Amino acid sequence: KCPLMVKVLDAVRGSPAINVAVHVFRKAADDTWEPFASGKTSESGELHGLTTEEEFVEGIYKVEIDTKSYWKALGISPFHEHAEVVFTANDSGPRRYTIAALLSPYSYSTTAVVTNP
Amino acid sequence: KCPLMVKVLDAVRGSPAINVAVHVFRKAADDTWEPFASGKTSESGELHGLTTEEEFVEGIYKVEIDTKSYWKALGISPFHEHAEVVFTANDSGPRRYTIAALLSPYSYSTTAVVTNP
Amino acid sequence: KCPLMVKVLDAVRGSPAINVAVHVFRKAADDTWEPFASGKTSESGELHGLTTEEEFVEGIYKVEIDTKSYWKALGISPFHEHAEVVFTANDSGPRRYTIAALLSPYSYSTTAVVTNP
Amino acid sequence: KCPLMVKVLDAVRGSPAINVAVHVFRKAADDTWEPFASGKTSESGELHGLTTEEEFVEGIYKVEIDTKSYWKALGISPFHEHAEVVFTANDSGPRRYTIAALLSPYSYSTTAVVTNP
Ligand SMILES: COc1cc(/C=C/C(=O)/C=C(O)/C=C/c2ccc(O)c(OC)c2)ccc1O
Ligand SMILES: COc1cc(/C=C\C(=O)/C=C(O)/C=C/c2ccc(O)c(OC)c2)ccc1O
Ligand code: NA
Ligand code: NA
User: Fold this and answer.
1) Interacting residues of B26 by C-beta distance below 8 A, sequence separation 6+
2) Which range marks the domain in which residue D2 is found?
3) Contact yes or no for A109 and D112 at CB 8 A
4) Which parts of the sequence carry Sulfocysteine (chains A, B, C, D)?
5) Is A67 strand, coil or helix?
6) Strand locations in B1-106, DSSP E?
């Protein structure tokens, strides 16, 4: 809830993207992706509570957003299988991460908002 | 053609946005918007030939893209009346400007690529 | 605070865009733009309290975001003079409007999130 | 060339993103990512010639754009390790795919333009 938040918006309907599956992975020493956390976006398009300060150590993380299932639910043919946002988490003050995604059937945009309390 | 080019893409269909009206204005000495050029995008989503090197002097220009008529023709009631850029041109000498717009019913993005001849 | 909110993000620094001037206009019967509301974004990149339910009637509105002054404050040369988000406000249930903008020096993206309480 | 093209733009400088590494993978029968093609963007920010009509069969493809090396070379420490698309190709017969990426240090967007030959 504190260190890693995801927010997803729908650019076709001008709304939060609701009930979107989100999977978070951390890169392991053997360079495979290890499941870390997951959830579904809320009615406000948000997913909180994925991890804790103590669990969210420096490392390379992947946030996969299942955009294809979302567009299929709406009856709209999409391009992407999903979105895959990959980043290194870096200590340097008590940083929080918000991964924002804006979805269209044939385009997505993702931004990171990195702040301090 | 070369000095000012517009490209418009549809993020719902993954296609050029074809036959989109584009109106260009230039700010006059009395701080009003004067008509400068207009046209429609081609089957490739592009609009060339709006102006010339001789005509495209220093100034503040506004490019208004009629996105609402575009979406309405496809059965969609969009949020915005139009997409735009407003920019100062040729401040440090002539440049070539490509204005790219990416359209969704409730979102748009406008990007400039500026090249030195 | 309720019916019209603006949120601005900085894609270069991964942060809220703070102290950005925002001006809202409503189109008048003579097709000129009449000042309606204005403010600066907060430390969270947000601007609330622009209008009230009673004041925010159907009409055509323009939200201008002074992006050029923001980039100038950061010492970064920008393309746009500002962003100009123009839309019709439409009754049909108790709708709220959030105008979100994502800023880069040579590109901006704007989305509308339109919801009900 | 014709079947799969990549274009990369820099939203900080308003320019093509030049000499950006691009790696393409194809999902194999055993659900692993197999190397398919790679290259670097030209002075126009474009990468052509990755594959052919004969080689580019139905499949799930991943295009990984090395945006982190790009930003680092310009003195910028960016948020993301790379930009990507993952997509199913040629499901309803051969198509021509242009993958466009627009880059900022803490944000990227990937758009597909899909044309029927
Ligand atoms: C104060 O800073 C923060 C802001 C936010 C954002 C909240 C929010 O409601 C977001 C928004 O309203 C929209 C964000 C946005 C805008 C344009 C885009 O292209 C996009 O996708 C890449 C997303 C989330 C967490 C924060 O810490
Ligand atoms: C001529 O029309 C076509 C264009 C293209 C592809 C690319 C092209 O010229 C695009 C461009 O020159 C600009 C593309 C663009 C615009 C906005 C963005 O946010 C973005 O990044 C996600 C990219 C592909 C097929 C076409 O038929
Ligand atoms: Na000059
Ligand atoms: Na087929």
Assistant:
1) B33, B34, B36, B59, B60, B61, B62
2) 1-117
3) no
4) 2
5) helix
6) 4-10, 15-16, 21-27, 33-40, 46-47, 59-65, 83-89, 96-104
CA distance B63 to B111: 12
Q: What is the CA radius of gyration of chain A?
A: 14
Looking from the CA of C56 toward its CB, the CA atoms found within 13 Å total: 23
Helix (H) or strand (E) holding A68: helix A67-73
Decide: A102 in ligand 1 pocket, CB within 6 A. yes
In angstroms, this model's resolution equals 1.4
> Looking at the 3D structure of chain B, how many domains does it have?
1
Cα–Cα distance measured from residue C32 to residue A92, given in angstroms and rounded to the nearest whole number: 50
Do the Cβ atoms of B16 and B101 come closer than 8 Å?
no
Q: In this structure, what CATH number is given to the domain that contains residue D81?
A: 2.60.40.180
Distance of CA A24 to the CA centre of its chain: 7
| CB contact A90 to C (< 8 Å) | no
User: Distance between CA atoms of C79 and B51, rounded to whole angstroms?
Assistant: 19
Residue among C84, C64, C93 at smallest CA distance from C3: C93
Dist CA C7 CA A109 (whole Å)? 16
Backbone phi, psi, residue B77, to 5°: -95, 105
Tokens of residue D25, six digits: 């993978």
Helix or strand holding residue A73 (H, E):
helix A67-73
The structure tokens 């993005």 sit at: B109
Altogether, the residues listed in chain D come to a count of 117
Residues C36, C51 contacting (CB under 8 angstroms): yes
- Please name the residue whose Cα sits nearest to atom 17 of ligand 1: C102
**Measured between CB atoms, does B2 come within 8 Å of chain D?**
no
Inter-chain CB proximity B109 and A109 less than 8 Å: yes
- At D110 the three-state DSSP class reads strand
Task: Kindly report the length of chain C.
Answer: 117
Would you put residue C75 in left (φ > 0), alpha (ψ -120 to 50) or beta? left
What is the position in ligand 2's atom list of the atom closest to the CA of A109? Answer: 22
Output b/e per residue, C23-39; b: 16+ Cβ within 10 A: bbbbbeeeeebeebbeb
Name the E strands within chain C.
4-10, 15-16, 21-27, 33-40, 46-47, 59-65, 83-89, 96-104, 107-115
Which method was it determined by?
X-ray
Q: Which atom of ligand 1 is nearest the CA belonging to C102? A: 17
